[PDB]
Swiss-Prot record:
Changing residue 288 to S: Reduces mannosyltransferase activity by more than 95%. Keywords: Glycosyltransferase, Lipid biosynthesis, Lipid metabolism, Phospholipid biosynthesis, Phospholipid metabolism, Transferase. The lineage of its organism: Bacteria, Bacillati, Actinomycetota, Actinomycetes, Mycobacteriales. The keyword Glycosyltransferase applies. Involved in the biosynthesis of phosphatidyl-myo-inositol mannosides (PIM) which are early precursors in the biosynthesis of lipomannans (LM) and lipoarabinomannans (LAM). Catalyzes the addition of a mannosyl residue from GDP-D-mannose (GDP-Man) to the position 6 of a phosphatidyl-myo-inositol bearing an alpha-1,2-linked mannose residue (PIM1) to generate phosphatidyl-myo-inositol bearing alpha-1,2- and alpha-1,6-linked mannose residues (Ac1PIM2). It is an enzyme of class 2 (transferase). Disruption phenotype: Cells lacking this gene are unable to produce monoacylated phosphatidyl-myo-inositol dimannoside (Ac1PIM2) resulting in the accumulation of Ac1PIM1, the absence of LAM and LM-A, and the presence of LM-B. Pathway: Phospholipid metabolism; phosphatidylinositol metabolism. Belongs to the glycosyltransferase group 1 family. Glycosyltransferase 4 subfamily. This is GDP-mannose-dependent monoacylated alpha-(1-6)-phosphatidylinositol monomannoside mannosyltransferase. It comes from Corynebacterium glutamicum (strain ATCC 13032 / DSM 20300 / JCM 1318 / BCRC 11384 / CCUG 27702 / LMG 3730 / NBRC 12168 / NCIMB 10025 / NRRL B-2784 / 534). Gene3D superfamilies: Glycogen Phosphorylase B. One of its GO terms (biological process) is phosphatidylinositol metabolic process. One of its GO terms (cellular component) is membrane.
Length: 378
């Protein structure tokens, strides 16, 4: 078995996107074949977290791990002491600038994972040159969507092999609701078995299209007067969303940031999941992939996704629909059409569940990572 050193500034107990990504990917591998080299934000909290793991974490006694001679030296000595075959930079920019040292230390394969930030790095002359330097020294560059790949591929260059490695979804936690649980969840919310329920789980920011959803509601409500739009999450755009929803107040619920299981129960009890993501910020405010769409499909719920970035890549014609959020007439039409067809909804949700089990689970994605880490270098 090939042994992997994960080099990262982004590791639990700190909460975040890359932290969750690495935690869950590492858990899919043989713990004996994994070593982590991570920065330390709070010493006692890090020690307490590492104590719970079945694999080794070597803590760098700095609040931020940066590409410096001292960090590179420490990485190099771990590579040799633990007989490391693969060096995996959990986030490419800027730590994968130490990839040269990793090969010097005797590693036979260097992997670096990109996420969202590298897209913006391809827009500036200096940051683009850094991306090229990473590309020239990295054997495998992973990406979350075909969209992000298109945005930064030319910057990295042709030296590395490019591999699709997005986050998976937990198909045991995100699972279709039993009739009992679905009925009870609705009653908890003050609804019934007959209530039309549209769920939107996402941070409350303009690009997620909660505003687009709210603007589509008047037509939805006219057709189905008891239809409820559930806005689940928190963010700075909340006050604007509430103002937008003023004339549809009886049919729009701001539930705030729900507890993890409560969010899942609410999601699984919905008739439709909708999040019409749009690209903003001059092309830089973009949906990299959209794990919420995979979570919905995992719960057996029909999806309406937006046109932004990698969002359309999460669904198939069998599982979901892609729409431009600002198209009020089409969005409301799609919502009414689906709400009025429970058979189509049942078929779409079933297809959603099958889709993620076949292509998006942590079991499937874990296998993808195993293939990268266990294959002989080219």
């Amino acid at each position: 078995s090939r042994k992997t050193l994960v080099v990262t500034n982004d590791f639990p107990p700190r909460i975040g996107g890359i932290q969750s990504y690495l935690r869950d990917f590492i858990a899919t591998q043989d713990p004996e074949s994994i070593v982590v080299f991570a920065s330390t934000q709070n010493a006692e909290e890090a020690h307490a977290y590492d104590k719970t793991l079945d694999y080794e974490v070597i803590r760098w006694p700095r609040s931020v791990m940066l590409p410096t001679p001292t960090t590179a030296h420490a990485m190099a000595e771990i590579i040799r002491e633990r007989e490391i075959d693969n060096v995996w930079f959990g986030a490419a920019a800027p730590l994968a600038l130490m990839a040269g040292t990793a090969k010097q230390a005797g590693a036979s394969k260097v992997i670096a994972s990109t996420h969202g930030h590298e897209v913006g790095w391809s827009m500036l002359p200096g940051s683009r040159q850094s991306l090229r330097k990473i590309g020239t020294e990295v054997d495998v560059l992973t990406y979350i969507s075909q969209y992000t790949l298109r945005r930064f591929k030319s910057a990295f260059g042709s030296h590395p092999t490019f591999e699709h490695l997005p986050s998976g979804v937990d198909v045991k936690r995100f699972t279709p609701a039993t009739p009992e649980d679905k009925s009870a969840t609705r009653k908890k919310l003050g609804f019934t078995d007959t209530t039309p329920v549209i769920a939107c789980n996402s941070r409350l920011v303009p690009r997620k299209g909660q505003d687009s959803l709210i603007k589509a509601m008047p037509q939805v409500i006219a057709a189905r007067p008891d239809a409820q739009l559930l806005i689940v999450g928190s963010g700075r755009y909340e006050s604007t969303l509430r103002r937008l929803a003023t004339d549809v107040s009886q049919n729009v619920k701001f539930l705030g940031r729900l507890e993890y299981q409560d969010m899942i129960n609410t999601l699984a009890a919905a008739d439709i999941f909708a999040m019409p993501a749009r690209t903003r910020g001059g092309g830089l405010d973009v949906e990299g992939l959209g794990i919420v769409y995979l979570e919905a499909q995992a719960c057996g719920v029909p999806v309406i996704a937006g046109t932004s970035g990698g969002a359309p890549e999460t669904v198939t014609p069998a599982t979901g629909l892609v729409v431009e959020g600002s198209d009020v007439d089409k969005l409301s039409e799609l919502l009414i059409e689906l709400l009025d067809d429970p058979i189509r909804r049942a078929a779409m949700g079933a297809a959603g569940r099958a889709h993620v089990e076949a292509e998006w689970s942590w079991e499937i994605m874990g296998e993808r990572l195993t293939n990268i880490l266990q294959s002989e270098p080219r």
